Write a protein that binds this ligand. Sequence first.
Ligand SMILES: CN1C[C@H](Nc2nc3c(c(=O)n2C)CN(C(=O)OC(C)(C)C)C3)C[C@H](c2ccccc2)C1
Length: 119
Amino acid sequence: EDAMTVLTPLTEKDYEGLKRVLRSLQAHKMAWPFLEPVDPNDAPDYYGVIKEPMDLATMEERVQRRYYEKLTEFVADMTKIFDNCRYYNPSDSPFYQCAEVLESFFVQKLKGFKASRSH
Ligand SMILES: CN1C[C@H](Nc2nc3c(c(=O)n2C)CN(C(=O)OC(C)(C)C)C3)C[C@H](c2ccccc2)C1
């Protein structure tokens, strides 16, 4: 529940489940802008505006290194991806439209992850 999301440390099973949320996100049609971090070669000024950059491969690495102790931390990193994108980009950007779609998809998958967890 909300009680678990905050209090319950991520169990090695939960870490299996988060790799599967993450893979389904890497598999979405509209995840392509976010699979890897923003090439500082190709967008030099981005890292001088975005304070907390994040991307899907960085998140997979933090999962592999069991870097998250609670699920709130995982959700917070994911949310950076979409918030940074909509902030940096004009709304007519294809990166923006992908953030809106894929965040909505992530919300669903997160409900699945929480419901499966309290069982
Ligand atoms: C690793 N790179 C990272 C890229 N991801 C990304 N790049 C930029 C922004 C962003 O928010 N993201 C998420 C903001 N941006 C930008 O300033 O665009 C303005 C319109 C000027 C506002 C540059 C996509 C790139 C790529 C490109 C084509 C096909 C596949 C991958 C793969």
